[PDB]
C-alpha cells in the first residue's frame, strides 16, 4: 500500500 | 559481458512512479515492486539535496551495497534522453541520521569490510512495520550471523552476541539479562548503524535490565 517510514 | 540492473522505487507517488516506468521502458530496465537479492538500484524520493526518509528499501539497499539514488536520476535522465551516471545522484543522507552522512556510498565501497562481521545477532520478540525475517536479512547482509533463540548463541571470550528488541512493540524484555550475558539493545542500534554504514557503539541503545 504505502511503505512505512522509520523515524 | 552484460549490464545487470533491476530497480525498485521507494516513497514515490503514482505519478512519479509512472515517470520511472517510462524511463525503464525506454532503457529496457527491469522494475519491480519488491526488493530482492537481484535488485541493483533503489530509487528514493528525496529533497533537492538528496536527503530521503528511511524506509525498509533504503535500509536493505544500503545493507546490500546497492545503488541508492535520488529520483532526480530518473527525471534528469528523461530530460537528457540517456541514462545518467548514478554517482551524480547518489543519496547523501536521511532525515534521521544526518543529511550528508554518505552511508550509501560507504556501504557500496565497503562490501569487503562489512559492519557487523564477527557479530551474532538475535532479533528478539515482536517488531512493527518490518517483519522479523527482513530485519534478520538486513543484519546478515551486513555480515552478521543470525540466531533464532537465545540458547543457541555460544561460545567463548571473543563473540560477540547481541540481542535486538523493539520495546514499544511489546516487561519481558527487561529480564533477558538475567538469562544470558549478551548486551540487549533497541532496534535503533541496527537501523542507525545500517543507515550510517557504521557499527554504532552500544552504550546509548542498551535496554536497562533487572539485576
UniProtKB/Swiss-Prot annotation, chain A:
PTM remark: Phosphorylated by ATR.
Compartments (UniProt record): Nucleus
Tissues expressed in: Ubiquitous.
Subunit-structure text: Interacts with ATR. Heterodimer with ATR. The heterodimer binds the RPA complex and is then recruited to single-stranded DNA. Interacts with CEP164 (via N-terminus). Interacts with CINP.
Domain comment in the entry: The EEXXXDDL motif is required for the interaction with catalytic subunit PRKDC and its recruitment to sites of DNA damage.
The protein's role, per its UniProt record: Required for checkpoint signaling after DNA damage. Required for ATR expression, possibly by stabilizing the protein.
Family of the protein in this entry: Belongs to the ATRIP family.
Name of the featured protein: ATR-interacting protein
Residues of the full protein shown: 237 to 243 of 791
UniProtKB/Swiss-Prot annotation, chain B:
Outcome reported for the amino acid change (mutating residue 90 to K): In BC; uncertain significance
Substitution effect: residue 6 to F: In BC; uncertain significance
Localization in the cell: Nucleus; Chromosome; Cytoplasm
Tissue-level expression: Isoform 1 and isoform 3 are widely expressed. Isoform 3 is reduced or absent in several breast and ovarian cancer cell lines.
Transmembrane domains' residue ranges: none
Subunit organization: Heterodimer with BARD1. Part of the BRCA1-associated genome surveillance complex (BASC), which contains BRCA1, MSH2, MSH6, MLH1, ATM, BLM, PMS2 and the MRE11-RAD50-NBN protein (MRN) complex. This association could be a dynamic process changing throughout the cell cycle and within subnuclear domains. Component of the BRCA1-A complex, at least composed of BRCA1, BARD1, UIMC1/RAP80, ABRAXAS1, BRCC3/BRCC36, BABAM2 and BABAM1/NBA1. Interacts (via the BRCT domains) with ABRAXAS1 (phosphorylated form); this is important for recruitment to sites of DNA damage.
UniProt protein name: Breast cancer type 1 susceptibility protein
Residues included from the entire protein: 1646 to 1859 of 1863
